[PDB]
Structures are given as structure tokens and as C-alpha cells.
Amino acid sequence: NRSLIVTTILEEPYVLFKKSDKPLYGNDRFEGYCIDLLRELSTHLGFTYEIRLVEDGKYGAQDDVNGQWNGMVRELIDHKADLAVAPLAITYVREEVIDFSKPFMTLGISILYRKGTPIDSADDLAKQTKIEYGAVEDGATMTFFKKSKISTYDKMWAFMSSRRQSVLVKSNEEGIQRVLTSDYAFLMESTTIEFVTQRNCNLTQIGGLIDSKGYGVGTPMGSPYRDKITLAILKLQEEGKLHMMKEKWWRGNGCP
Amino acid sequence: SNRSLIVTTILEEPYVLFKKSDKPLYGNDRFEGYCIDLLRELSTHLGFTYEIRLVEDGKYGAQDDVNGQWNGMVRELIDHKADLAVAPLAITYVREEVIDFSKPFMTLGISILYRKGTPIDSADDLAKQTKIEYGAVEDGATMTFFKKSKISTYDKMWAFMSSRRQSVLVKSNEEGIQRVLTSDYAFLMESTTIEFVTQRNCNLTQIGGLIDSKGYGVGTPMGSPYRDKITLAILKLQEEGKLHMMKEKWWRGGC
Numbered sequence: 001n002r003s004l005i006v007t008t009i010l011e012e013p014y015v016l017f018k019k020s021d022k023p024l025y026g027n028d029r030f031e032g033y034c035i036d037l038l039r040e041l042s043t044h045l046g047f048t049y050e051i052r053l054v055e056d057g058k059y060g061a062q063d064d065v066n067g068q069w070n071g072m073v074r075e076l077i078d079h080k081a082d083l084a085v086a087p088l089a090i091t092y093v094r095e096e097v098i099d100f101s102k103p104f105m106t107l108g109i110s111i112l113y114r115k116g117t118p119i120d121s122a123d124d125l126a127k128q129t130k131i132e133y134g135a136v137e138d139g140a141t142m143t144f145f146k147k148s149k150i151s152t153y154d155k156m157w158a159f160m161s162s163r164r165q166s167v168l169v170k171s172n173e174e175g176i177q178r179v180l181t182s183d184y185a186f187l188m189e190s191t192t193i194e195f196v197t198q199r200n201c202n203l204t205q206i207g208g209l210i211d212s213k214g215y216g217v218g219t220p221m222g223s224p225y226r227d228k229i230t231l232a233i234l235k236l237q238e239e240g241k242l243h244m245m246k247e248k249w250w251r252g253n254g255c256p
Numbered sequence: 257s258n259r260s261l262i263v264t265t266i267l268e269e270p271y272v273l274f275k276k277s278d279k280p281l282y283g284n285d286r287f288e289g290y291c292i293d294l295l296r297e298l299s300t301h302l303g304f305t306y307e308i309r310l311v312e313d314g315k316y317g318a319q320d321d322v323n324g325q326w327n328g329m330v331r332e333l334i335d336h337k338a339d340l341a342v343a344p345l346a347i348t349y350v351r352e353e354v355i356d357f358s359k360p361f362m363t364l365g366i367s368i369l370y371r372k373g374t375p376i377d378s379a380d381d382l383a384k385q386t387k388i389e390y391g392a393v394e395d396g397a398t399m400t401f402f403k404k405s406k407i408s409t410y411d412k413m414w415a416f417m418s419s420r421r422q423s424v425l426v427k428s429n430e431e432g433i434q435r436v437l438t439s440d441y442a443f444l445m446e447s448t449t450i451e452f453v454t455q456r457n458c459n460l461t462q463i464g465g466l467i468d469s470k471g472y473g474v475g476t477p478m479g480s481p482y483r484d485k486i487t488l489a490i491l492k493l494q495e496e497g498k499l500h501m502m503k504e505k506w507w508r509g510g511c
């Protein structure tokens with residue numbers, strides 16, 4: 001049968017290009033948690049697939065003026081991909097336009113910053129401007145702040161929006177580099193913060209989780225794959241396989 | 257006017273309780289708790305009226321392996337005896353095969369409730385001994401997790417629970433807590449419930465971490481159009497901070 005087209009995005013340790021000396025081709029180019037997940041889904045559901053990086057490099061947000069979506073969300077809306085297998089947050093505005101499986105991982109927005117400071121919460125950032133802060137442009141964290149009616153988060157959005165050319169970044173990688181090279185705190189998903197702080201011993205999570213959400217496999221609205229992938233995810237979780245996959249991709253040396 | 261939806265639920269503090277009062281209470285007015293607040297929010301967002309009915313057999317729901325029949329709130333949905341189940345109802349593979357669920361409104365896992373002051377640190381420590389008995393709610397998701405598990409520790413625990421089931425499987429979380437307090441017994445319990453119980457009884461503790469991960473969702477019959485509408489409403493409530501506020505309201509109180 002026809003191979004499914006799977007849109008994804010580079011994001012360690014979910015999706016990475018494998019390191020090698022020989023050139024790699026096709027699906028063999030990729031590894032990571034989400035790649036292992038895709039392989040398990042493919043064997044459980046009995047499909048073959050072709051992995052394609054989303055061409056615009058975005059997760060997906062709606063443009064407030066013209067109403068168009070971008071990123072992996074737009075690929076699904078336009079039926080250019082059958083699945084999005086990535087650390088793609090299940091959100092209200094996305095669920096209105098695409099379908100998602102039930103979550104394979106649960107997480108929330110938090111703060112990545114340097115250690116040793118009196119900053120302990122989002123409120124501490126919101127009430128000042130000397131320490132800049134931001135988020136990935138056109139992702140779920142940005143959209144959370146843009147939409148929020150909560151005073152602290154609305155204030156933070158006004159700051160980020162004013163300073164967006166400097167403080168909104170194109171990837172988590174760029175946000176980490178800003179934390180490491182300037183006085184800057186990055187609003188980042190907690191699963192990713194866990195990965196980063198175990199490898200950057202001068203960095204830490206500040207405060208707890210600001211919200212709660214899951215990552216799910218995206219499908220076009222109405223796809224028959226959505227409910228089948230939910231069932232496969234529930235089976236992999238119950239059997240302990242998702243936990244093993246998390247340990248594989250997050251485990252490492254650590255910090256004193 | 258549209259037919260009111262029949263909502264099946266189960267008594268379980270602080271999700272669903274009878275209100276305390278001296279005058280008698282009637283109809284929906286009898287009930288309070290996190291899930292009742294959730295139901296009220298869903299009804300205003302989606303535009304329905306409802307009648308709350310406690311599940312007749314007092315069970316969450318499991319399948320009988322001899323005759324294939326389900327029980328509990330799961331069976332009420334399969335048979336279209338309820339439109340919705342709004343309860344701490346775990347989303348599980350075996351249930352998702354037969355009913356539909358919204359996306360989760362809370363995330364949790366199985367853990368262990370026991371008395372303080374013990375070297376027992378995990379399910380592995382329990383499984384390797386038989387002096388301390390252990391069990392779970394009969395015909396709920398925790399029992400079914402053990403019954404289905406191929407993981408050696410958990411399959412050893414199921415063998416023990418099954419052997420001793422008339423004594424160690426209980427009808428409700430409340431009966432499990434009473435067994436922990438009145439005998440040498442550890443209860444396999446969902447973590448959000450452990451959090452509630454241990455903040456109010458300072459002689460009790462959680463043992464170990466979470467053995468698994470799952471969510472609670474609103475149940476619907478398979479194919480219901482309410483499932484995806486309720487998912488959207490839950491996502492909106494989460495993002496606005498209302499689910500967090502509801503958790504704080506119903507779990508607030510310390511040791």
C-alpha cells in the first residue's frame with residue numbers, strides 16, 4: 001500500500017539527523033524519540049512511511065491578519081502530509097483545524113535560565129526588563145502568551161511582542177544559545193528543559209509548570225489514523241515502551 | 257427544549273461527593289466536587305442540560321474474561337444508558353476499544369498508599385514478599401493494569417491479588433484506605449487520590465513513584481459527537497487556567 005507522508009521538524013532529542021561519515025538517504029537519515037515512536041506505530045498499524053522535514057521550519061500558528069496557518073499544522077490542513085510525528089503540542093486552536101492522537105507525553109511551559117539568581121517565577125520576570133525573555137516564534141508557547149488573559153502572562157506578551165525581533169527565536173536551539181550568551185530567560189517546554197539542564201550544568205528550570213499540555217501525533221481533520229494511533233500509543237504506554245524510549249533519549253551523564 | 261443528557265458518575269472524594277446539609281437535597285443539587293464543577297463548565301460551554309445518575313452497579317468498569325461482558329460506567333456507555341461519564345475515569349487501551357474518551361483533564365499514575373515508617377520503597381519490594389498484603393479496587397483500571405501486565409513484578413503481584421482477591425480487592429478507594437489503616441496492607445491507588453488522602457491523614461504516605469502514566473477523560477459511547485466537542489472545551493478550560501483553579505479548590509487544605 002501507499003507510504004504515509006510524515007512531516008516532522010528537527011528538535012533534539014525528538015528528531016535529529018544521525019551522525020555518520022557515509023551520506024545517509026531517506027528515512028535512514030533520522031533518529032530520536034519521535035523516530036522510534038514512528039517506527040513502533042508503523043509496525044503496530046502496518047504502514048510504511050516517508051519522513052519529510054517541514055519546509056518552513058515551523059510548528060504552526062495562525063496569522064492574525066490573513067488567517068493562514070503555517071508549519072506542520074498547515075501541511076496537515078492542506079493534506080500534504082498524512083501524519084505529523086514531532087513534539088507537537090495539542091492545543092485548542094490547533095484541535096479546531098487538525099486532529100490529534102491522545103498524548104504520548106505530558107509537559108508544560110516553564111523557564112530556562114542560569115543558576116544562582118533570585119529569579120524564581122514568571123512573575124519575577126514580568127515585573128522587570130533588565131533580564132530579557134522570549135520563546136520560539138510561531139509555536140505553542142508563544143501562542144499561549146499571545147492569547148492569555150492572565151495579568152502576568154499578558155504583561156510578558158506585551159514585552160515579547162515589543163521586543164520580538166530580538167527575543168523571539170526560530171528554534172529551541174537558538175533560545176538556549178541566547179540563555180548561554182546573554183542575560184536572557186527562555187520560555188520552553190518542560191520536557192525539553194529536562195534534556196537541556198542535564199547537559200548544561202550552569203542552567204536550570206525556574207519555577208514550576210505554567211500550564212499543562214500533551215504532545216500528540218497530528219493528522220488531517222477526520223483522518224481514520226487518529227483513533228488507531230491513539231490506541232497504539234495507549235498500548236505502548238501501558239507496556240512500558242514509552243517510558244523506555246524516554247529513558248533512552250533523555251539518559252546521560254548529568255550534573256554534580 | 258433539548259433532552260437532558262444522562263451523566264453517569266461514581267462517589268469518589270474530591271471528584272464527586274454528596275453535599276453535607278441538614279435539609280434534604282434533590283436532583284443535581286445533591287452533588288459537589290471537582291467533576292461536578294467540570295460538568296457545570298461543560299454544560300455552559302456546549303449548551304446542554306443534564307441529569308446526574310450514580311452508576312447503578314457502583315463500578316468503574318472491566319470486562320469479564322469468561323462471558324466478554326463489561327460492567328460499571330463503561331457498560332452504561334456501551335449500552336447507551338448514559339450520554340456521558342464525568343468521573344475520575346481512566347483512559348485505557350481496553351476501554352478505548354469499546355467507548356470513546358475526551359482528551360485528558362488530569363494526568364496521573366498508579367502508586368502505593370501505605371503507613372509511614374517502613375523500609376518498603378517500591379512495588380518490587382512488595383512483590384517479593386507476602387507478609388504485607390496488597391490490593392486495588394475491583395473492576396477498575398488499576399486492577400486491570402495488573403491483570404494484563406507482562407512485566408514480571410506486576411504479573412507476580414497480580415498472581416497474589418487474584419489468589420487473595422476476596423480479601424485484597426475492595427469495592428472503592430475508601431475501603432482500600434480503611435484496609436491500610438486497620439491491617440498490614442498496602443493499596444495500589446491512583447496518585448491524585450493518594451495526594452488527597454495523605455494530606456489529610458498524616459499517618460499515611462505514598463511509597464515509590466508512579467508505576468504508569470494515564471489520564472482521566474470524559475467517557476462517551478463509541479461514535480458520540482460529544483467526544484470531540486468536550487475535548488475542545490477541556491483544552492480551553494486548561495489554557496484559561498480553570499482546571500488548575502478547580503484542582504486547587506478541591507485539593508486545598510497539610511501535614
Ligand SMILES: N[C@@H](CCC(=O)O)C(=O)O
Pocket residue numbers: 059060087088089135136138139140141142187188189
Ligand atoms: N512544541 C511547540 C514548539 C516549542 C514551543 O512552543 O515551546 C509546538 O508544538 O508549537
Ligand SMILES: N[C@@H](CCC(=O)O)C(=O)O
Pocket residue numbers: 316317344345346392393395396397398399444445446
Ligand atoms: N479511576 C479508576 C478506579 C480506581 C483505580 O482503579 O485505582 C478507573 O477509572 O477504573
Ligand SMILES: [Cl-]
Pocket residue numbers: 100101102230357358359487
Ligand atoms: Cl481523542
Ligand code: NA
Pocket residue numbers: 009010011057171
Ligand atoms: Na528545527
Ligand code: NA
Pocket residue numbers: 094095096097098099100221
Ligand atoms: Na480536531
Ligand code: NA
Pocket residue numbers: 351352353354355356357478
Ligand atoms: Na474509543
